[PDB]
Ligand binder design. Sequence first.
Ligand code: NI
Lengths: 85, 85
Amino acid sequence: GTPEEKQALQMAKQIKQQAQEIQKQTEELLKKVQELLKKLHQLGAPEMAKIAEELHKHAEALKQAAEEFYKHAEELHKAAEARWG
Amino acid sequence: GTPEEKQALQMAKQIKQQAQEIQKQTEELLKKVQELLKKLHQLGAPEMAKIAEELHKHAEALKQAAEEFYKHAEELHKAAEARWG
Ligand code: NI
């Protein structure tokens, strides 16, 4: 394999790793938002609860975007390995 | 702030902090995708370029969701401080 092909193979593997790491992080963050939401609902805090529920929708969007990225990162790694692995 | 209020405020701070950590990693990840693209365009591997460009789209989408999450998280933390901090 050429130095360059080998380089691109390794870049793809690194992107896949970082994608995995970010996805886990997004899962933990959603959990934290859920937790906070439960507490604010118990606190009779309607205006805080309202923004906490919009924040939970954003945490869902973030976890979803991370998962979508990871799917394509795996696909790119697969394709690189097929060619150059 | 009552103890439970102060707890919700700490939970918001921790959500803010993790949001900042995630945004930073999504910036890094997009840089990696950009650098791979440069390399794949160079190797004239158009199928690989096609995957990488799709991944480029997803990296921007992911970084955008992390930025939007962080904006909302900071706004919630700041309201929580207004009430309880
Ligand atoms: Ni896609």
